[PDB]
Write a protein that binds this ligand. Structure first.
Ligand SMILES: [Mg+2]
Ligand SMILES: [Mg+2]
Ligand SMILES: [Mg+2]
Lengths: 351, 351, 351, 351
């Protein structure tokens, strides 16, 4: 019932640069382990976990909030945003896998209840040129009901590509654009106003996460819904964002914002402020699982399903979840419903 | 004058628990070195420096802002506050020691000019009971014009001790109280109203750095000036602190908030908002030096002079600065005016 | 070295009225000189310099901020805006030429670092009628990527001319309109809404610099980005402009707003408020140089390149900077990289 | 009746440094002259008048607002505050002396009507130590009902002197304190709270004219009424001061803010905002006269009566006004009721 060993692992591989992820395993005196993930710079997150590890060993895993508050009280002064929050999120997601196992229930049921047993996720596909059209047509064939494309190659370059992908997918499939704060307010509305004709479901991270007044103005000047919050941490950060009427959709990453415990608190806030929540997910199947269980408990929904090459997701992590013809099905298995192939873990670790 | 090797060093020391601070040495192709420091969890900052090190090598040190913006562009999605900011701060302070050396001028002169050639710092002395009175009497005897005491032992316990220290130091010496966000709004005004009679120069971090409305209310309900910002990072963070009329004095830590480059930008903002700036300093002389040079360029001033038991500061780092009868004299030496005893560095290092 | 002699010179020439500009030369004990410029009424600025000259002689030029603060402390009650600010600006730009020379580095590197080694400036061309089309076609042929035209001849007269210039330059070249506060809110949106179809990059000084609510409303009712701040002085003035969400682009004139020192502080503020900065430039190459070095340090960019008939700029001032096919290249020479032909200086002057 | 010659004169005199003030004489084709004054740096104001002089010659003096608007249209881009406003003020006050003479009526009657035929001004007396007490006792003996003292020598030094002057003058005479923005918010309330016991009628310029939030806060934390606006220029400047609920009393200087025309417009605004107006006066009798006529038309009042050593005020300018036992009597003579001794003018002139 008590924590015996927290074990952070930095997993990597280069494809065509490198993908460096930090992954934890918290195991109890009884052998009951739990899998969690942190989002950001792998090796920095890994040291973060090491920082909290002394104050978590021999303490009870069911009262996960008592541990979250200990980690918070310890890092408050040196955290707020960034790295130590990804360290707290990584431990949290594992304590929710433990609890799920421990109380023999999935995480969604343990968060309050499965509100959506089926989810329809969107396919993410970032960038010659005609290859993007093929990647999109693959997703439509793969049953997907929506797809998220990466923009930031230039206002006139993007509008040329957005036109091409919309022509391929037709009008029935949903399409979203993601800048990655690669544009400024003037550059964002120029793209927004011009891309409106292609029925864009939303615009993800259009300006700097620091440009709150820019987000609000963009929302006022375009019909396309405004997404943001990848870079937003804790209940306090998202309150600050919602008080500014910035986004139509809040996108906290479970692995970054403060884990399942805090993204649930952010979900309460989103609700009160009457703002939609679609979490951000860009890691292994441990990361994806936490989102599966969160959107199930959220009140057909969508979630981020990275279709990009990644053997740290497909090979290192083992999911029980089922996806056929754009629809994903929430698992009933205790905890997140994930494991790590310890041979593929050792093969893909870092030096 | 390109960067050839960035070298982060975690140095440990237990007295009566442990004091673990991270430090950097950036050395150019020409063997010009510069010393820097990060504030927060040593081993986490140390990995942070390692994160930016690949994109800093083979780049010119004089154009320090080009490097700051590269580090920012790289961490803007996974930082905003905490750990990666103290990694950016640490590199910055060392690039200012390099520039100082390189152009054969002190940092203050290189920040714009020595406005205050003499500064009068305050003595910090945290916690049987009668020992606190002796530590204070020592500081008054040592020439100090002001002293900062730590509070959070209970409203009635603090008021008992604040009365004792004021009785010892008399009326001529300034005295400040520091909660360390160990109090809530109701607990803070209870102490503030009760401690008003013992002439308190300021109340440092009275409530949570997240409780902006609490700071503002406390400022409205007490005569004692309100200090805060230890836990505030970047120009964007201090703009939101100032927009909410929270503090009378803003206290950014150079080694945490974004280095000398950003604390200077925070100084421009503080100026525009007509709010005083006294930086936070709690490290080695690499950290103290950066503050010496910053308050010199700021427009008799004070700064944080840690007077606690610290061999890591007093032994590993070598300062040139002179202090006699409460007054500190800004050095004219190129750069920060600091060096590291490489034998005491090897002796005090962490495994 | 210390300041031995500040020398203001009012220079003029009538072409087809007169252009009366004031310039300064600050000369050190060691004969190190620095060239500066003030923007506004020459003879009034010239007396301004004379006002500060007594309190600047025998003082050190490297600690330029110590001098800026002396000039400020002296003229704060009788300044805030206008004439004495252009007096402080003129001295500042020359102390930055001195420092550049003194420390053997260009101004941009000395402001923090060259962020943009290449800039693409815009051609200014103010006003029968068919002559304007030829002036524009000349700029397009001269490789310019953008051109700024003067408007204020009447809503229907301007829309007639804007149509003509856009027809000549085609769709690939950028085009901006400048009212010179010659329009009121009702007259401004009438032009804005009608001129949109001609792809206008921005609208410069659309209403009175005093009509902040007019600027905000115009921004809300038109797609064309709103420029302004020519007439704005100091960090306090620009804070006041940004607090009211007036402009998309802030245009401080280095030679008017408070020199390189203050336009840099305005640049920190613009950054915090997430508003673009394109400085205003309308003088000699002393003025153009200061902007070259400022936009280089700012984070392809543009700047104001006056392409009208002016011999005080082309004959009295000597530049090192290179311009070939719309692109300008930041110089590496110590200081601004400018000199004054003292024979042409004596030739163009005032009794 | 057109303007034939505008003549600015810079008059200098050293006592125990120099007092350099600029004065104007506008004379019509018919030999009707009018005397004016500008407040600030004499030689800078003198060049300002020279700037507008070309666009004022051969134009009618009764339609003074047509001239004010011409000067404004010309200066707005390079003025807003300071020097060019004091040039516009100087011309304005002389056009009001002309109009007064021209229509054979005093200025107060020509501003709308004498509301107060008798006004009780205050004696200004800035700074061994015991000499201040004697200067105050002289004023009480001279009949004065109120006196304004200069503060900024240090919080404990001022409280020592304020106590001394109050002891001498007794309880019946009013007493006001003037910082001259020599204090910051923390330093201002320290002085305000401590000086409350000495019945202070008002606190003039307590913080920087730029620290609007400081003024507002000080007003909230002290019982002593807050004065300010010396450094405020135009109707636009005073609207922004009043919008922020800064002052209890607005103090525009006629010779600086925009002359009698603008201080009257500022008076309309002050009225609408329900804020008192006591103008700032620190020049010759040309300046004092303009205030006599303005407070007469304002709706027993007070005004600034400089009682220091001033040979330019008492020798160069000739007044008709009468003062006996603290009460001043508004003159009925056409215009301001002032002349200049042309021999003492030629004597005190500058090179
Ligand atoms: Mg995204
Ligand atoms: Mg502290
Ligand atoms: Mg313009």
């Amino acid at each position: 019932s008590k924590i015996k060993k927290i074990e952070p692992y930095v997993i990597s591989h280069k494809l065509d640069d490198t993908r460096k992820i930090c992954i934890v395993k918290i195991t109890l005196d009884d052998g009951t382990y739990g899998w969690g993930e942190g989002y950001g710079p792998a090796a920095v997150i890994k040291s973060g976990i090491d920082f909290f590890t002394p104050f978590l060993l021999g303490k009870e895993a069911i009262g996960h909030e008592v541990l979250w508050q200990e980690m918070y009280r310890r890092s408050m002064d040196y955290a707020r945003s960034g790295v130590l929050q990804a360290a707290i999120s990584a431990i949290d997601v594992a304590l929710w896998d433990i609890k799920g196992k421990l109380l023999n229930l999935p995480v969604s049921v343990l968060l309050g209840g499965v509100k959506n047993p089926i989810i329809e996720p969107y396919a993410t596909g970032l960038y010659l040129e005609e290859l993007l059209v093929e990647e999109a047509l693959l997703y439509k064939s793969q049953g997907f009901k929506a797809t998220k494309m990466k923009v930031g190659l230039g206002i006139e370059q993007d509008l040329k590509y957005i036109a091409a992908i919309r022509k391929a997918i037709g009008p029935d499939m949903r399409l979203m654009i993601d800048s990655n704060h690669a544009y400024c307010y003037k550059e964002a509305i120029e793209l927004a106003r011009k891309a409106e004709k292609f029925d864009i479901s939303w615009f993800e991270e259009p300006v700097s996460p620091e440009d709150y007044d820019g987000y609000k103005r963009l929302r006022q000047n375009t019909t396309i819904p405004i997404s943001g919050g990848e870079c937003e941490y804790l209940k306090y950060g998202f309150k600050r964002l919602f008080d500014k009427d910035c986004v139509d959709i809040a996108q906290p990453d479970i692995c970054a914002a403060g884990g399942l415990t805090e993204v649930k608190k952010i979900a309460t806030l989103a609700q009160t402020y009457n703002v939609d929540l679609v979490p951000h997910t860009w890691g292994t199947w441990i990361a994806i699982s936490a989102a599966v269980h969160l959107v199930a408990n959220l009140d057909l929904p969508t979630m981020e399903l990275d279709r990009t090459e990644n053997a740290l997701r497909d090979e290192v992590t083992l999911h029980k979840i089922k996806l056929e013809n754009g629809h994903l099905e929430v698992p009933c298995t205790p905890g997140l419903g994930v494991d790590v192939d310890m041979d593929k873990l050792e093969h893909y670790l870092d030096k």
